[PDB]
Design a protein around this ligand. Structure first.
Ligand code: BGC
Length: 371
């Protein structure tokens, strides 16, 4: 579905995506989120990093992806005691506050980069489980390399999956977000269906909890045939297609999958650029590369190759003169009056965003375009 002009440009953007991710990877293995964006400099997120790692793994850079997994594993093994203490607190009937939970931002040396009172999130731990299992399966690797870190993440998620937390967008701590539940589900199903992990003590529990997640989403996370942004809402969010591919709450051909893709397209997709959610005021609520990629990936998986390609083309059109992809662009803004204050406070939008490049690589690979 691409002519020679397009193929050459998409291949170049794929090469550049690999280069900019691997050039910015820290010496210790972490992928930074946004190396030139002042507010985020020096920090890694498991969400951004896991999708970045999946793009890199698909591209075939086994060494780079493995160094990311090494970094995450080591960071998590260092939290074995913190997690054990949280679990012991629960067993005494003393549920830990958000302030005591595992962090969202990490420094490259594995310390808390932010205070979880202000940004407590569980999705990234689920994403990491999905990512490391998927990588190991793809490349025929022994998961024992990363198993003790996997164990920490699994124990944590089995205890805390059903807690309210901030969403992927670091908002609304009181709610339970369907793409957060979806990320956890994806990670738990990945480990619970992995033959190499068949004897883990938590093996059965992971699939039972994944079923509990699906029960909760069925009860409170579906309205008018589509997934919704958080349990008990009516709105959609551009992250919701992740609950189809890759996280697997429903197959790509399920009616809920189709309806969710359609609702996201109708409510949030403007000319191929997907907004996060209707109420979004961050930088005025622009169009996010990673969300267009996510929708494209989902369209490809459902057999809508043309729709996938349209989103791939839109993403490529957002690359700057160096090939770098921003987090978002302002061609359409949901709340334009809100934009200038974000720019005054934090500067211009993060570019490159490694996750943008990682998602580009995933979609390109889905469409058979990795050179
Ligand atoms: O890139 C780091 C973080 O930036 C935030 O603005 C986004 O809402 C998160 O989804 C992302 O993980």
């Amino acid at each position: 579905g691409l002519d020679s002009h397009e193929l050459a440009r998409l291949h170049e953007l794929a090469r550049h995506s690999h280069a900019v991710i691997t050039r910015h990877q820290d010496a210790g293995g972490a992928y930074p989120a946004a190396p030139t964006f002042s507010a985020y400099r020096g920090y890694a997120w498991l969400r951004d990093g896991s999708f970045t790692a999946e793009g890199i793994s698909r591209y075939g850079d086994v060494a780079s992806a493995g160094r990311f997994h090494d970094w995450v594993d080591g960071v998590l093994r260092r939290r074995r005691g913190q997690v054990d203490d949280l679990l012991a607190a629960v067993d005494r009937g003393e549920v830990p506050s958000n302030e005591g939970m595992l962090p969202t931002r990490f420094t490259f040396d594995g310390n808390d980069g932010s205070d979880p009172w202000w940004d407590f999130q569980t999705d990234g731990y689920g994403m990491w489980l999905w990512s490391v299992v998927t990588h190991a399966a793809r490349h025929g690797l022994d998961l024992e390399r990363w198993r003790a870190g996997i164990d920490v993440a699994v124990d944590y998620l089995l205890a805390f999956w059903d807690r309210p937390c901030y969403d992927w967008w670091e908002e609304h701590v009181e709610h339970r977000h369907v793409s957060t539940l979806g990320a956890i589900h994806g990670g738990l199903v990945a480990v619970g269906t992995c033959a190499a992990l068949r004897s883990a003590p938590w093996s059965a529990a992971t699939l039972q909890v994944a079923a509990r997640i699906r029960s909760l989403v069925s009860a409170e996370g579906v309205v008018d045939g589509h997934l919704v942004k958080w349990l008990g809402s009516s709105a959609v969010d551009g992250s919701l297609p992740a609950c189809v591919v890759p996280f697997g709450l429903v197959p790509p051909d399920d009616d809920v999958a189709a309806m969710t893709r359609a609702a996201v397209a109708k409510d949030l997709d403007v000319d191929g650029g997907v907004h996060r959610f209707a109420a979004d005021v961050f930088y005025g609520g622009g169009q996010w590369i990673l969300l267009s990629a996510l929708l494209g990936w989902n369209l490809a998986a459902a057999g809508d190759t043309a729709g996938a390609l349209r989103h791939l083309r839109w993403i490529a059109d957002q690359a700057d003169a160096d090939g770098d992809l921003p987090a978002q662009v302002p061609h359409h803004l949901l709340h334009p009056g809100s934009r200038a204050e974000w720019v005054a406070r934090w500067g211009t939008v993060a570019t490159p965003l490694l996750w943008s490049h990682g998602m580009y690589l995933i979609l390109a690979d889905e469409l058979g375009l990795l050179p």
